[PDB]
Amino acid sequence: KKQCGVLEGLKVKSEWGRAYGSGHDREAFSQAIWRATFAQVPESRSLFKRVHGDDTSHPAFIAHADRVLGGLDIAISTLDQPATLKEELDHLQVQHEGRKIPDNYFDAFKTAILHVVAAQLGRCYDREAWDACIDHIEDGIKGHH
Amino acid sequence: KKQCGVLEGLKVKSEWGRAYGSGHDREAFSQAIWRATFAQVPESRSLFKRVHGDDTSHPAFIAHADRVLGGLDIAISTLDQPATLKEELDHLQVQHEGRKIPDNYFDAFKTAILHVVAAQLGRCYDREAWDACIDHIEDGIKGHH
Amino acid sequence: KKQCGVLEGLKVKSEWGRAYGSGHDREAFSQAIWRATFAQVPESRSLFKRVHGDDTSHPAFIAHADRVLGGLDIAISTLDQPATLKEELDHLQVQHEGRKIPDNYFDAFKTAILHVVAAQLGRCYDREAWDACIDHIEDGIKGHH
Amino acid sequence: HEHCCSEEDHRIVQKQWDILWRDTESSKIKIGFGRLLLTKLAKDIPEVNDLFKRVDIEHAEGPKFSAHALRILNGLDLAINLLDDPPALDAALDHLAHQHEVREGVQKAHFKKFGEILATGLPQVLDDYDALAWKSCLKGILTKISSRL
Amino acid sequence: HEHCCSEEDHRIVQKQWDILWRDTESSKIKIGFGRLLLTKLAKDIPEVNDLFKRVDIEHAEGPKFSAHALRILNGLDLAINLLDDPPALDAALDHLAHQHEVREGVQKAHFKKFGEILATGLPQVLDDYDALAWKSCLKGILTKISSRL
Amino acid sequence: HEHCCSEEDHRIVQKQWDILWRDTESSKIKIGFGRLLLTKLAKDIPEVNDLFKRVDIEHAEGPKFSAHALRILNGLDLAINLLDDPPALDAALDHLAHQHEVREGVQKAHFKKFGEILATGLPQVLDDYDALAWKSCLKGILTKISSRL
Amino acid sequence: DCCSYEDRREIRHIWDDVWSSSFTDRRVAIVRAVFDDLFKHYPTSKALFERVKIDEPESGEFKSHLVRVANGLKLLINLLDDTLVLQSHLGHLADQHIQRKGVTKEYFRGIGEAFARVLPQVLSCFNVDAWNRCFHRLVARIAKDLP
Amino acid sequence: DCCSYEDRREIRHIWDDVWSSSFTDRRVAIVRAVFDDLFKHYPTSKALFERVKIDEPESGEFKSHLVRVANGLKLLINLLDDTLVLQSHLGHLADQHIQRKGVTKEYFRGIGEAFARVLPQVLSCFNVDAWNRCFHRLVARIAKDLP
Amino acid sequence: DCCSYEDRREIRHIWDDVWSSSFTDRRVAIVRAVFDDLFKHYPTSKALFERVKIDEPESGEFKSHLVRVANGLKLLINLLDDTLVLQSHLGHLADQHIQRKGVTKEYFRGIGEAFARVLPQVLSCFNVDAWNRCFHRLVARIAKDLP
Amino acid sequence: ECLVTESLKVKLQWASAFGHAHERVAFGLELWRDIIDDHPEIKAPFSRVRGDNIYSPEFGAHSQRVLSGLDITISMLDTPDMLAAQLAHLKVQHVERNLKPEFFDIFLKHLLHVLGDRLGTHFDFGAWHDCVDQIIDGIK
Amino acid sequence: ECLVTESLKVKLQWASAFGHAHERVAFGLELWRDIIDDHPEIKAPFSRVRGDNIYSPEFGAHSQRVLSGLDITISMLDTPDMLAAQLAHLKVQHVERNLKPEFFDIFLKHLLHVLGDRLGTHFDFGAWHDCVDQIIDGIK
Amino acid sequence: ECLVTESLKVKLQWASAFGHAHERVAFGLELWRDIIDDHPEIKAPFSRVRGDNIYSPEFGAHSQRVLSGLDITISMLDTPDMLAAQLAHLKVQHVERNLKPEFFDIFLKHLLHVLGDRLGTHFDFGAWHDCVDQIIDGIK
């Protein structure tokens, strides 16, 4: 419905900055996203058994979740630097290829991100801009169209 | 009991300044004086029909009352400048000659001014100095002794 | 258990500084000590009839109590200056010789000082150091061993 | 609400104007300032001198012109002090409107000039002056007084 | 006379005086200052040197006169600290009066001189000094101590 | 060792670190700073250039190394942001420890140098820097990451 | 359609969010998008920028031109509370544009429309009305003698 | 009869009301009234003011003299909280009057009585007792060597 | 065993109580005691102080030396919150002691034990643990190249 | 040339910058310290009032006398008759001392600078400069 | 020589010291008052912008333009292509005026002084000096 | 000549003006900035302590060392035996450096100036001057 262009990349960057936060807020944010993902595709949980996915309060899972948002952070932050973004998205792709992650999952994840962010920011967020840019980030991780 | 001399004029100028106020306080002050006048000589009300004297909350009446206190403000402010005062007093006298205003009315007005001013300033006012100086001002509007 | 040497003299001076206070706190401090003395040796009270010892709130007794702490203050403040202290303690001894004050009383008074100071400073006080130093001061006032 | 001489606008104007009357010799200030304003007005539009013959502008320092200067200055004081009460302000400005209407020669162009003179002179006495707030508030007032011309 | 060393007067004095004991070597300050005050008194009224023979003013730096310097400074401290309790203060100043009465040679002139020396010296050590408050308070204190002379 | 990177220690570190992201072009800052640190690391220990062959350190300004500079900066940002949650922090640093364990050549000596470079560099960008708090916190983190080496 | 005190205060809040970093990237891209918008709605305006090298849109002389505009606007926003300074400076800016023949009232209308269309895309909760009201007042003065 | 700290504070509040405007009219008129009172009660004092032109009481030289007195008094009041400066300045004011042969303690008693009669007429809720205490203290020093 | 931010703050409170007065008596006597303790436990250290006259312990040159140490320590404590200035100064203090042959790591250990034995005698509610933690950290740097 | 609006401005701004009890004392000190810092010769004529110690009560008294004097002249800006007389009076009080006319220029320079600090960007330099200049000229 | 850390320090510190609306105006006035006080010749070239009255709205405008210009260059410290172009542009704007190159040294001297006041003991003098020196040289 | 009351005054006033942790740091920097500003030659002898950058941690340390030194001497004004020894010690530390004796006088002018700002009108200039002058003479 909208493309991840200059302006929408600029917007998402700002809004991420504001939603992402730090310390305890970041842990909570990290958790809220995964829980929303799991609520939508409880199937996906089995992929996270090695990282105590059964319990989203387990420290090993917090680390994993913060680690994920860490990757998302690099991607969003370089939306305006295509070459760097490409290099980061390839690194991530290499780390997700081999795993059996159907589009179904990335799709739920995206919905979680958008859901939790909209909560963080109240009115001040653009759903269509986010949707486009997360889609764009996810394409590079899947390697699929 | 006391004449509107240099010192009484000085005192009345200051006490007027403190009681006159501004904004909503000035409106309330303007109304307090006219209501006190009407309470004392209800007959006088009929004179103000063209300016909605029947309702002291009416905007046209406020404007009129602010206007009156504006005239009084000029008079008090120049008690120390007799030549200017006379010229203002003549201007006002021209605006009142023609109207059938008995002394009885200027008299109630004076009582009302003193009453509202006494309330506004509590202890810190001199009734004898005000009485004398309001008289002096009204003598110039009436044109009478 | 401890002698009033350099370090303990040092500590008592500071802690006395903190406990002594001024104005109304000082009056209260003075009364608290004398009440604590009287509570332990009610017999001693008769010594203070000239100074209204029957009523610790009497202005003449406040004066006496401040005067006492005035003398104690000099003694404590000069713990580190033995020649000056000796001079002060001799002056006090002369004012107390002839009065029938048994060791029993100096002893209760010392307990009182320590009790009130301890309350004044909560934990931040060294009882053994105070004990040694008040002892040393009282020895000079008694003239006795 | 509404952006022309808004709530905050007129509150800024009232606060800033009030500074002028911090001290008790306010007649002295009203006369000096008003004299300056009208004098400058007549300087720029010479026909104005005729309009003020009845008040002896010829002798600007005179008691006649002085009283008049107090009169206009209190008229402007009245408007400003009624800014937080739009309907009472309208009654007041309409009354002023009639008063100028019955004077032949007084025309809209004079009020546009007065506004400029007023805009220039005010910052010269007030060391705190929001030009935008005064401009819009002055415009509303000047337009209302001069509408019947 | 409720306006001599009034409530606020004595409150000012106590606050300004307190400042001298912010630090813990108060004895040092008391001795230096008291020693200075009496030394100056002896200078201006030579007969005073005899009055302080028992306390060895001859060796102002010695332990004898040091202890005395403290005794007097604590006397003045006592009075100041009791200013907020007039009847207790009176008891204390009466006691001081008796103490000076039994001393031969001590006279009211000495107390007038001391008050001057004191009014001069206090501002040299306190950088916050209400001369008026101190003057009225010191006078009351000095007069009561010398009434029995 | 409850006094090594204590509660207030890590709170100081988090507050001071946070100032670096007061603005939105954090990636620009992350890349600049990260690139500087590793560039300096390779300068001091030349064998490090080989270790970063895969991320194209050869072209430090290139998109390859830029991404990597971000990855490390966020790695350090992850640890800092978890200082207030020790068990989560340990899980996080343990994970990093494995990631370096599986790299041939990387040794404890490298992490010691990096600590130094980092200690010198941080105050060059942060105008508010508690050297003691950063030192203890950075040691804890650097040590946990390099234990499997 | 007057620029109220509330609008000015609103614009200050808005402005903190568009004008972040003390790096140029963000303020280059937003103004570039504003100009792309202008050139789409008034293509002949694009010829006014050959001296600053639009032909080389990543040249640095053009990027710095974009920043000069960005900072000129930042200047105006930060003067919205010093109205006499603002008045004076606005004339200065007017004179700079009068000395470039070809700059018209129409093109300044267009940059207003460009900002109105672009700013809402860079930040949410943007009060476009308060922004337009003040931007129009600023532009009215800058373009007084332009056409 | 000492000038207390409360009294000095009381006099400050009083003084804000007499000494308003940065115009001379009010302070010309109050001081003129004070002197009229002095001259009415101590007529021989009037002869001391010929150099400042009492003979032409609207002259400007005499009006400026009245302001100098007004401001001298304003200076004293505004020193009521800087007692050492006050003490020093008081001697200066003393010397200025000692160099005027003819000025007596009696006349300073009279000006005191004049202020006590006049001030209560220019302002209400005036604490004349507090005023007198402090004004006597001031005058005591000014007129120490005058008689 | 690291000098935490809490320790450093804790020491700031403590320090107000040992380092009172702007006279030297208290700070001569405490440091004197610290050294007496040092000489009791490491008597060969006493020979390092002949130049500042330990032989005349009431001499003034010796007392001023005691004050120099006191103020040196006072400097360190007042730097516990400016860590970069601290880091730098610590090096300076190190160089002053390196340039005195005979000063060893052992003696600095000994002054540490001296302070921990003595300080609790001059003030109560002293947190010796926090003190030692920070004092060791300071001494570690000063004595880095000493032995 | 101080017209009506400027004298009014100066009167108003002076009312704020001057202040009251102790605020006047601090203003005066800051002023003279600046002046004497920039031109130490100016201490010489202040010999009778402890110009060597501007923190003394003697000099504080002098300082206050000066500001009170400035106050009189500022408040007379609108009454030429009174202003002429007052300026003549102040001149008598300055004429027999070896004061270089430029001393007053330095005074004005520093008065404006200290006033600038107190009033900030609102300080009507133009009005002040015109207005006080005339005062300085009458005493100079 | 402004490395990456120094340019970043300057960027961060500028953000604080510069401030926003009226904060900037006060900063600019303080800066130019300091400069012009020290070197009154610097008023001459400011003939068109009322350099004789720094409190006037005309000079305030000029002053704001300058700070905004400084802001542009500081934000460009990390983009040499842009910095070069901008410094050239700024130079064009000063080249035809009788400006001694030392004027810019004085400007710098005072900029670092006022910045030191605003930022305190945290002021990265070394970083600023390096970094802005380059900017000054490009316009000089 | 510093008598008992003046030394006591200086101690008390020093206690306030000096301050504690970072309050000292800002004081010292403000002082040296004023001094080196007035007299750039003074940087030369400060070569080892980065006198060229007074905001560096090296100079910050030197500055703290100085104020701590001033603090020893002030606390010793009443103990002549100790003062004599300490001033001798300080002289030793200054004597083999090309320090014009008037450098110390500049130091005093500026110490008094900055202390003046801190303590205000309560500043006992007379006492400070007498008192510190003595400390300076012992080092000079």
Ligand code: HEM
């Ligand atoms: C937009 C999105 C995503 C980003 C940026 C992302 C990023 C990451 C990052 C940075 C890691 C850690 C790499 C490492 O250090 O080992 C990670 C691990 C992983 N991710 Fe993702 N991811 C994303 C979406 C998903 C989705 C949708 C799934 C499937 C539900 C998924 C499944 C995993 C799994 C299973 C691991 C490994 C956990 C383990 O270590 O046991 N990721 N991802």
Ligand code: HEM
């Ligand atoms: C001390 C007193 C008084 C002052 C200063 C005063 C002043 C004024 C002023 C300034 C106006 C407005 C002139 C205009 O702009 O049209 C006015 C109008 C008027 N006054 Fe008075 N006045 C005073 C007493 C009275 C009294 C006692 C009465 C009778 C009770 C009265 C009856 C009127 C009437 C009827 C109008 C005209 C109302 C209208 O416009 O319809 N005034 N007066």
Ligand code: HEM
């Ligand atoms: C350690 C402590 C003591 C100190 C420092 C001390 C000090 C003093 C001082 C300064 C006076 C006033 C001398 C004067 O100015 O006339 C005084 C009086 C006196 N003291 Fe003590 N004293 C101490 C212990 C005691 C004890 C233990 C007693 C017996 C319970 C006692 C009984 C008296 C009596 C009876 C007077 C005379 C009261 C009067 O004036 O009638 N003192 N003492």
Ligand code: HEM
């Ligand atoms: C903001 C503006 C103004 C206000 C508030 C104002 C107010 C007044 C007031 C209160 C009066 C006296 C009414 C009365 O009591 O009889 C007056 C009279 C008059 N005004 Fe205005 N006025 C304003 C602007 C002007 C302007 C711009 C002109 C110039 C054409 C003007 C021309 C007159 C004239 C000619 C008179 C009659 C003078 C006379 O008494 O002969 N006014 N005005």
Ligand code: HEM
């Ligand atoms: C503000 C005033 C003064 C206070 C508070 C004061 C207080 C004292 C005190 C507390 C003592 C010791 C009493 C004792 O315990 O035996 C004392 C002793 C004495 N005072 Fe004062 N005094 C003051 C002024 C003077 C003055 C002006 C003189 C001058 C003649 C003076 C002459 C003496 C003498 C001669 C002694 C006896 C010294 C001795 O031989 O021990 N005092 N004073």
Ligand code: HEM
């Ligand atoms: C404070 C410390 C450090 C942190 C937080 C850190 C973090 C990281 C992270 C997050 C990665 C990428 C892991 C991935 O593949 O997703 C990484 C890779 C790496 N790190 Fe570190 N690191 C740190 C210090 C060092 C040091 C001192 C060395 C020097 C030997 C080092 C050598 C490497 C190497 C060689 C790689 C692999 C590069 C590649 O992709 O080929 N790291 N580090």
Ligand code: HEM
């Ligand atoms: C809201 C508006 C605008 C602002 C704040 C603005 C600001 C600026 C600034 C600060 C400069 C640089 C002046 C210099 O230092 O040389 C500039 C130059 C210029 N502007 Fe604008 N401008 C605005 C709108 C426009 C519009 C609508 C046009 C017409 C399309 C325009 C055309 C130009 C041109 C042609 C130049 C000169 C380019 C060159 O040759 O260097 N500007 N503008």
